[PDB]
Design an enzyme around this catalytic site. Structure first.
Site, PDB file in Angstrom:
ATOM      1  N   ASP A 140       0.697  -0.973  -0.232  1.00  0.00           N
ATOM      2  CA  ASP A 140      -0.406  -0.025  -0.366  1.00  0.00           C
ATOM      3  C   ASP A 140       0.535   1.336  -0.068  1.00  0.00           C
ATOM      4  OD1 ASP A 140      -1.655   1.606   0.547  1.00  0.00           O
ATOM      5  OD2 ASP A 140      -2.767   1.188   2.259  1.00  0.00           O
TER       6      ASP A 140
ATOM      7  N   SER B 205      -0.532  15.412 -11.975  1.00  0.00           N
ATOM      8  CA  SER B 205      -0.978  14.682 -13.435  1.00  0.00           C
ATOM      9  C   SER B 205      -1.033  15.949 -14.052  1.00  0.00           C
ATOM     10  CB  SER B 205      -2.408  13.774 -14.062  1.00  0.00           C
ATOM     11  OG  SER B 205      -2.417  13.611 -14.895  1.00  0.00           O
TER      12      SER B 205
END
Ligand SMILES: O[C@H]1[C@H](NCC2CC2)[C@H]2CO[C@H](O2)[C@@H]1Sc1ccccc1
EC number: 3.4.23.22
Length: 330
Positions: free
Chosen positions: A35, A199
Site C-alpha cells: 500500500d 497530472s
C-alpha cells in the site's frame, strides 16, 4: 541488494493485490497488500481477537526466534473506506522477494474491523508511503522501504500491477524489459506523507486531451481511480445509460456497455487506461448494473490514482533524496 516479488489479484475484478512476505525465523509467509498510500506494516496474528479472524494466515511472534516485543509500543490506523485495525508491535526479520530487513517493525493486530475479517485473502498490509505517516506510538517506526533503502542498489521500488493477471514489485532496480518507450519522471510532494504528484490532464476515449492540473496520490492500496467530479462526469457522459447512484455509492453503468478508455497526462507523456480496466462488474450478483472504476473524489479531499490507473503503467517510486515518480506505458 535487490528484491523481486510477484503480486497477484485477490479476485477476478482485481479488487486488491497480495504479495508474499516472509516474517520471522523460521519464516512465516503472509500475503500482504502492498500500500503506497500508508506507512504501517501490520498483520493478522496470534494476538488478533479470535472472532475477527476468518481464514487469514496469522503471524505468531512466539514461534519466531528473532521476534522482540517493542516495549510500550502500540498502533492504530483507519483507512478511507472506514476500516481500521490496531494492536502492539514486534521487531523481526522481514523479507520480500529475496530482500531482507532485520529489525523491521511488524505491527501485530489485536483488533481488526469487519471488512478485514471478511476478506480471507489479505493477511495484512505493507505500507510504502513516507514514514512520517507511520502510526506507532510513542516512537514512530520506519517502513520496509525506508529500512531497506541504503542497502539497495538504487533507492527505488517499482509497481507493475497486472490487469486480471499477476504482476511484480521490484526493490532496488528498474527492469528495463518491463515497459515500452521511456519512463517519464514527475515531481513529488511529500508534505502530506504520500507519493503526491500533479497530472497534466486527461482525455476520454478518442477525445481531445484537456490540459489541466490534477493533484493526486499514487496509491497501490486503493482499487479505483478517484478524480474531480468534473472529470468523472465527462468520462461517464460517454457511456450510454451511466449514472451516479446515491444508493449504490457512485457511478454505475449498464453491464452491456462498451467502456471508452481514459488517458491521463504525466508531463508531456500519456498513459492510456483501456476501457475494460474501468469495469468492476455487477453491483450485486446477477445484476445488469455494473460498478464503475472511475469515481468522484469530491468526498475524499484528495484525488487518488489507485490500481485502475497504476495497472496501466510501469510505475517507479524513486526514493532519492528528492523523491520523484516515474510512469511508462507497458
Ligand atoms: O480501495 C479502497 C480499499 N479497498 C481494499 C481492497 C480489498 C478491497 C481500502 C483501503 O483504502 C480504502 O479502503 C480504498 S477507497 C478510499 C476512499 C477514500 C480515501 C482513500 C481510499
Amino acid at each position: 541488494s535487490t528484491g523481486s516479488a510477484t503480486t497477484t489479484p485477490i479476485d477476478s475484478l482485481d479488487d486488491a493485490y497480495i504479495t508474499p512476505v516472509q516474517i520471522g525465523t523460521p519464516a512465516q509467509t503472509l500475503n500482504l497488500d502492498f500500500d503506497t498510500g500508508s506507512s504501517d506494516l501490520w498483520v493478522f496474528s496470534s494476538e488478533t481477537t479470535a472472532s475477527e479472524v476468518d481464514g487469514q494466515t496469522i503471524y505468531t511472534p512466539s514461534k519466531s526466534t528473532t521476534a522482540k516485543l517493542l516495549s510500550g509500543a502500540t498502533w492504530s490506523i483507519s483507512y478511507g473506506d472506514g476500516s481500521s485495525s490496531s494492536g502492539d508491535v514486534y521487531t523481526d526479520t522481514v523479507s520480500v522477494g529475496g530482500l531482507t530487513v532485520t529489525g523491521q517493525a511488524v505491527e501485530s493486530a489485536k483488533k481488526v474491523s469487519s471488512s478485514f475479517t471478511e476478506d480471507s485473502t489479505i493477511d495484512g498490509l505493507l505500507g510504502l508511503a513516507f514514514s512520517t505517516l507511520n502510526t506507532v506510538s510513542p516512537t514512530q517506526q520506519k517502513t520496509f522501504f525506508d529500512n531497506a533503502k541504503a542497502s539497495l542498489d538504487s533507492p527505488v521500488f517499482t509497481a507493475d500491477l497486472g490487469y486480471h493477471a499477476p504482476g511484480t514489485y521490484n526493490f532496488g532496480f528498474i527492469d528495463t524489459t518491463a515497459y515500452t518507450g521511456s519512463i517519464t519522471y514527475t515531481a513529488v510532494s511529500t508534505k502530506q506523507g504520500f507519493w503526491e504528484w500533479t497530472s497534466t490532464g486527461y482525455a476520454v476515449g478518442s477525445g481531445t486531451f484537456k490540459s489541466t492540473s490534477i493533484d493526486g496520490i499514487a496509491d497501490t492500496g486503493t482499487t479505483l481511480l478517484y478524480l474531480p467530479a468534473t472529470v468523472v462526469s465527462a468520462y461517464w457522459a460517454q457511456v450510454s445509460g451511466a449514472k451516479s447512484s446515491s444508493s449504490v455509492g457512485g457511478y454505475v453503468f449498464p453491464c452491456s456497455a462498451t467502456l471508452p478508455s481514459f488517458t491521463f497526462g504525466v508531463g508531456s507523456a500519456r498513459i492510456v487506461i483501456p476501457g475494460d480496466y474501468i469495469d468492476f462488474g455487477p453491483i450485486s450478483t446477477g445484476s445488469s448494473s455494473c460498478f464503475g472504476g472511475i469515481q468522484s473524489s469530491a468526498g475524499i479531499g484528495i484525488n487518488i490514482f489507485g490500481d485502475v490507473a497504476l495497472k496501466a503503467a510501469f510505475v517507479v517510486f524513486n526514493g532519492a533524496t528528492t523523491p520523484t515518480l516515474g510512469f511508462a506505458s507497458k
